[PDB]
Each structure stands twice: as C-alpha cells, then as structure tokens.
C-alpha cells in the first residue's frame, strides 16, 4: 500500500491546532483520550504508535482481544485520526498528534450501538486497562498519574433516548474529572441527541469549509467544529473524506486533550471540567467557551453554540 505525503486537513488548520504543537502535541504521559466508536484500524501507519489500549464492549462482554477491538466499519478509525493522526511524512495529522488513544469499540460492523454497550464503554474508559477507577483511593482519577483513567471521553454517537443508568454513568465520568464530548447528531434537529444533551457533556455541531453550520447539524450545540469534507485515516491503512457531527466531535476532543496536556506539563495537575454556562478561564469548558470564534448572532446561538473551538487561544488562555 502506497502512503501519500502528509497533508494538513483544512479542519485541523481551522481549529488552530498546528501552532500549539511546539508547546505540546498532547504526548504528556498522564493524558489519554478514550474514543467510543466502531473500533480502530490498530495497525494503521498514521495511527499505531498512538493506540495505547484497544478494547471492545460489544454485546455486554468486555474483550481486550485485538480481533474483537478492530474496526470493521471505518467510522472509528476516521474519528481517531482527527484527534491523533501522527505528525510525520505520511497521511494526515490530528489535532493532538502525539496523544495516547484508548479505542473502546461500543459500535459494531454496521455502526449500530446499544446504550448498554456504550455505558459499559464509558465504564471501561474510567477503569482503564487495570480494571480499577481509583487505585490509591485519593479521589483523583483523571489527572492522577498513579491511575490509567482517560481524561477525555469522545462519543461520536447519540440517540433519542434519555436513560437514567446511562446518565448515572456519565455522572461517574464527570466526577472522575473526565471531560466528555459528544456529537450533536445529524437529523437537522432542534436540539442534540443523548448523551450530547446532558449538562455534563459537551455537545458538538458541524461547520463546513466556508464557516456555515451544516444543514444536517443538530441545533443548540455547546461548540462547533469542522464537520464537512473531513479527510482522515480509514481502513485498511488508507484515508477517506466524510461529513457529520461525528467528524466535528474529535476536533473538540483534541483541543481538550491539548488543553489538559499543556496544563499538566506546566502545573502537574489538570483543569476542572466546568459547565455549559461557564465563561471563566478556570475550567476546560469556560476556556473553550471564551476562546471560541463567535460566529453567527452574537454570543452563544442555536447554530454554532459558543463558536468554533480554537486550540492555540484555548491553550494560551489555560497557561496564562
């Protein structure tokens, strides 16, 4: 297979990721991003070095087998490559191109997913490879270097149901200090699907290369991000261009990874997650809000949410 020379997708350059790399590419050892999706092409040349853990929760059975964790769809590999494709001579590059990834396969060969499997996926992101959320009992989970919990949960998926046990699990992730990001959905609907609709979760809408919201993007997102004509990694060891709020999501998850990476590199702790409301520089979500490129009507609006995330500003604000 003939690997093409590296290019930087227009989305990466829109969310202002490249100027951050000299500070961090996200390869701070305590930082992992868990991507709950169709799995990953774990051997892809532009992804493999960053795949820290590969696991599946399909049908309520947790498997660490590689065969069970492999992407049979493509959607996972595409998403992961937007966050984390390696900065090198080949392919594309991710927003956080040195960040460690946990690929948690909660969606099948068809891209279909049960809420029970997703919930187990969230659970595995918290527990991490060692099966234990908080091994030393200190209450610090995300950002504790003694633990292996992810710091970001990325969910390019959603549905119409709002279920109490799924919400309870989201609550657990929030209280573990994990930033949760999820796709608004692609029905052109009035509001986001779940879990993007939960207050603890960042809802993400899709813009196109002209900076207009995509007509399919579910409205009332918290932030927005490149979601039309997005080139990324794709099976098997190749690339593909896709659209959807599924492609916007990982841009935002990458920016959060850059923020917590930068902040930990400097201070030896991570930022609090924050709320949808937050307009301070003291939490991840407030930083994301106040540094977003306010598009559309002034301030937060039903199309763009607070705006297009901008990593270079967000990190400068985190470190200031």
């Amino acid at each position: 297979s003939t690997q093409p020379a590296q290019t930087i997708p227009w989305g990466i350059e829109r969310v202002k990721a490249p100027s951050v790399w000299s500070i961090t590419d996200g390869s701070v050892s305590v930082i992992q991003v868990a991507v709950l999706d169709t799995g990953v092409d774990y051997d892809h040349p532009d992804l493999a070095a960053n795949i820290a853990w590969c696991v599946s929760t399909l049908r309520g059975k947790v498997s660490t087998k590689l065969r069970d964790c492999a992407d049979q769809n493509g959607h996972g590999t595409h998403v992961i490559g937007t966050i984390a494709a390696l900065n090198n001579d080949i392919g594309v590059v991710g927003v956080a191109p040195g960040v460690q990834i946990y690929s948690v396969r909660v969606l099948d060969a068809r891209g279909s997913g049960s809420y029970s499997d997703i919930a187990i996926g969230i659970e595995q992101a918290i527990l991490g490879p060692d099966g234990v959320a908080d091994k030393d009992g200190d209450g610090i989970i995300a950002g504790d270097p003694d633990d292996d919990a992810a710091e970001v949960i990325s969910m390019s998926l959603g549905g119409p149901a709002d279920d109490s046990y799924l919400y309870d699990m989201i609550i657990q992730a929030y209280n573990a200090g994990i930033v949760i990001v999820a796709a608004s959905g692609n029905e052109g609907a009035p509001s986001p699907s779940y879990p993007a609709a939960y207050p603890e979760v960042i809802a993400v809408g899709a813009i196109d290369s002209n900076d207009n919201i995509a007509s399919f993007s579910n409205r009332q997102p918290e932030v927005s991000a490149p979601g039309v004509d997005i080139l990324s990694t794709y099976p098997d060891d190749s690339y593909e261009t896709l659209m959807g709020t599924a492609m916007a999501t990982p841009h935002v998850s990458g920016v959060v990874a850059l923020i917590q990476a930068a902040y930990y590199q400097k201070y030896g702790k991570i930022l609090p997650v924050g709320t949808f409301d937050d307009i301070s520089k003291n939490t991840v979500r407030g930083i994301l809000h106040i540094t977003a490129d306010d598009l559309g009507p002034t301030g937060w609006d039903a199309d763009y949410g607070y705006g297009v995330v901008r990593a270079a500003l967000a990190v400068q604000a985190a470190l200031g």
Binding site: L107, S112, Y115, E123, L157, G159, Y165, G185, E187, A246
Partner: protein
C-alpha cells in the same frame, strides 16, 4: 428475550433472583449500582417487583452521526 438494564440497591438485590423469572445476567456494572439482564418479554413485569430493584429500563439504540 429482550435486553434491559436494572438499577438496584446492591446491598438489597442479588443477581440469582433473575434466573427464577427466566432471566440471565449479562453484565454487572462496577461503577454504578446497575445490571444488564436478558429476560423474556412477558417477564419484564416480574423483574420490576424484585427486592433491591429500583428501576428497569429498556436497552435503546444509538444513531451513527
């Protein structure tokens, strides 16, 4: 059978309860007091009433965006 998720009081519920009404245990969450269970359709009524059982919710489907 259908897949449901039962939220429970752990120290009041015991997994062996479900086999009596036709159920089997799929997965016991480690971080929330909940349990994924396969039950026959006609038996969901029976699950609702067991000791330690706070809630029964059906297993829903996500849409790939």
């Amino acid at each position: 059978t259908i897949r449901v998720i039962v939220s429970v009081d752990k120290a009041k519920f015991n997994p062996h309860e479900v086999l009596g009404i036709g159920g089997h245990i799929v997965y016991q969450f480690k971080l929330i007091p909940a349990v994924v269970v396969d039950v026959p359709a006609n038996a969901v009524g029976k699950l609702k009433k067991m000791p330690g059982v706070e809630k029964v919710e059906f297993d829903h489907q996500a849409v790939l965006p």
